[PDB]
Amino acid sequence: GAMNSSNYAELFNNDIKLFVDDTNVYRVTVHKTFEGNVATKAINGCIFTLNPKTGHLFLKIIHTSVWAGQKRLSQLAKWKTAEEVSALVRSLPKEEQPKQIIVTRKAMLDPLEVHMLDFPNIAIRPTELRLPFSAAMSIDKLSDVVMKATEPQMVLFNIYDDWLDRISSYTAFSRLTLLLRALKTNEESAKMILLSDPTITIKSYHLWPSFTDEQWITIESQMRDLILTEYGRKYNV
Amino acid sequence: MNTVPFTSAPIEVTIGIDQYSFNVKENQPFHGIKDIPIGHVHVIHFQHADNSSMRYGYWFDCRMGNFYIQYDPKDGLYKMMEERDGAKFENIVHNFKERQMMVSYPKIDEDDTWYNLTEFVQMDKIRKIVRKDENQFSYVDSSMTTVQENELSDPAHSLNYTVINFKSREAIRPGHEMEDFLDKSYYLNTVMLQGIFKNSSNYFGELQFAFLNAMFFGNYGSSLQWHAMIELICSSATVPKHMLDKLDEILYYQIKTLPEQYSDILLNERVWNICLYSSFQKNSLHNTEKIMENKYPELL
Ligand SMILES: N#CCC(=O)N1CCSCC1
Numbered sequence: 001g002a003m004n005s006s007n008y009a010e011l012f013n014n015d016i017k018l019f020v021d022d023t024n025v026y027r028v029t030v031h032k033t034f035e036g037n038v039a040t041k042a043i044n045g046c047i048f049t050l051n052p053k054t055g056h057l058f059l060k061i062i063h064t065s066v067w068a069g070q071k072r073l074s075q076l077a078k079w080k081t082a083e084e085v086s087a088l089v090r091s092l093p094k095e096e097q098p099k100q101i102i103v104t105r106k107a108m109l110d111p112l113e114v115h116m117l118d119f120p121n122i123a124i125r126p127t128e129l130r131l132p133f134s135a136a137m138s139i140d141k142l143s144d145v146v147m148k149a150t151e152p153q154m155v156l157f158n159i160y161d162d163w164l165d166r167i168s169s170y171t172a173f174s175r176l177t178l179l180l181r182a183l184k185t186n187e188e189s190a191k192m193i194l195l196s197d198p199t200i201t202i203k204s205y206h207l208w209p210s211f212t213d214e215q216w217i218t219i220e221s222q223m224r225d226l227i228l229t230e231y232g233r234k235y236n237v
Numbered sequence: 238m239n240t241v242p243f244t245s246a247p248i249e250v251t252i253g254i255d256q257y258s259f260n261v262k263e264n265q266p267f268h269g270i271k272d273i274p275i276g277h278v279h280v281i282h283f284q285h286a287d288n289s290s291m292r293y294g295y296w297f298d299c300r301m302g303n304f305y306i307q308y309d310p311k312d313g314l315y316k317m318m319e320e321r322d323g324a325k326f327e328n329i330v331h332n333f334k335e336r337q338m339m340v341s342y343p344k345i346d347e348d349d350t351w352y353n354l355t356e357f358v359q360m361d362k363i364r365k366i367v368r369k370d371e372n373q374f375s376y377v378d379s380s381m382t383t384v385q386e387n388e389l390s391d392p393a394h395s396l397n398y399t400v401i402n403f404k405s406r407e408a409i410r411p412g413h414e415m416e417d418f419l420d421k422s423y424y425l426n427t428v429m430l431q432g433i434f435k436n437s438s439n440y441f442g443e444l445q446f447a448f449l450n451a452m453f454f455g456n457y458g459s460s461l462q463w464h465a466m467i468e469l470i471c472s473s474a475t476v477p478k479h480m481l482d483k484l485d486e487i488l489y490y491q492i493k494t495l496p497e498q499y500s501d502i503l504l505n506e507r508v509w510n511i512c513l514y515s516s517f518q519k520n521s522l523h524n525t526e527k528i529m530e531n532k533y534p535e536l537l
Binding site: 079083110117 | 404405406409414415418
């Protein structure tokens with residue numbers, strides 16, 4: 001069934017599972033043509049496939065060539081996502097394959113169920129959680145690899161850096177979703193918070209800065225304030 | 238014109254014969270139904286006055302034997318049986334006809350309703366769906382489950398309809414996942430028609446039989462089967478022209494015959510709205526769309 005606030009701890013148990021988010025697969029810029037009509041230009045996208053227990057991120061880069069000559073691209077994008085996730089599962093050793101795949105949008109259920117018919121024991125589930133994974137392209141190193149790709153490509157990351165050496169996966173996911181919610185609500189301010197201290201840097205093999213435990217507490221408080229502030233600016237509270 | 242004689246009517250019961258029905262009181266001098274048209278399957282069905290639970294009945298074809306109904310007081314139902322002594326059968330049927338103890342199958346001469354509802358239905362195919370090989374007639378009731386239902390529990394008492402499942406390996410070719418799910422033509426034409434049913438007549442026959450079991454017995458699994466066979470055609474972009482024109486006629490007469498008061502439980506809103514207004518064949522069922530919009534505009 002669906003994943004919600006009540007069965008939340010299931011994410012961090014020892015059954016392999018993956019979240020799949022398709023919000024950045026089909027991306028366009030809208031512009032005016034010489035005749036004054038409107039047209040779209042696709043730009044590179046990505047499937048965001050995340051193991052919430054380990055932080056392993058399977059970032060499948062969707063190159064704009066995959067749309068060439070195709071119709072109904074927003075529909076195709078869901079089936080292309082399902083095709084690539086299915087290929088990833090088949091490429092993994094049996095003992096690494098997920099026992100559940102949770103899709104962040106309900107429109108992915110049928111495309112993924114159909115592409116996974118060969119895996120009847122892998123449960124395909126929706127969620128009632130509003131997760132902020134659309135903001136993945138606000139992480140600079142992820143946006144950079146997507147935009148530079150000249151061909152389809154899979155790139156592997158750990159979205160938690162080395163956090164699990166010091167905190168649990170529950171706490172790491174809470175940190176990640178707070179960071180992404182902040183980047184989604186006000187990208188400029190969130191990035192200012194994350195980078196305004198030159199003395200704290202991002203390791204070459206990391207996505208986020210090398211904050212100490214105490215500094216992460218301050219950063220996390222600043223992101224909460226940002227989200228609350230935007231909430232009031234929005235609603236005039 | 239053939240006859241289904243009855244030994245007696247010991248319990249009060251509503252008797253159906255095809256789309257007709259009538260009340261028999263407890264111990265009323267009722268000995269059967271005469272003037273039954275030769276050339277069609279027929280169904281004789283029952284609902285006891287004291288327990289409307291369990292409608293039940295028998296599909297039969299009088300060209301295949303001499304059939305009679307006798308009440309069994311142990312099993313508590315009206316049972317169909319075959320009389321193998323043709324002489325005793327004739328002689329008994331005549332006595333009843335002379336004493337006018339039979340109702341006459343009440344077909345109006347202009348009326349092709351029953352033909353139109355059973356056009357492709359053949360006893361030999363009914364007996365493969367309803368397995369009981371030692372009888373030439375077939376028992377169905379309200380509660381019988383289908384083979385597909387049993388997968389999701391007595392197999393000898395099941396309805397062996399052809400399993401249709403849109404999210405199944407059978408329905409989806411590897412590498413054509415999107416194509417085959419959104420346009421089911423492969424599954425309809427290659428898997429079902431060429432592969433399993435062999436021709437459209439057998440497909441329509443099972444469709445018509447499923448509808449009739451849904452309508453006469455309120456059999457839920459039969460209603461699921463009817464809707465699935467409609468939706469598979471409507472969700473296919475490539476269907477023979479003669480099949481679409483015939484489907485429109487089949488459905489028109491089914492919708493025409495359905496009781497107005499039973500439409501809330503025998504018609505699936507999602508399937509009909511999809512078929513008439515969203516699907517590939519949304520503009521191919523003119524007669525069915527017109528009767529649906531005038532008779533059941535609430536459902537739509
Ligand atoms: N005896 C005998 C057969 C019998 O009881 N029947 C009564 C009405 S139905 C066909 C003859």
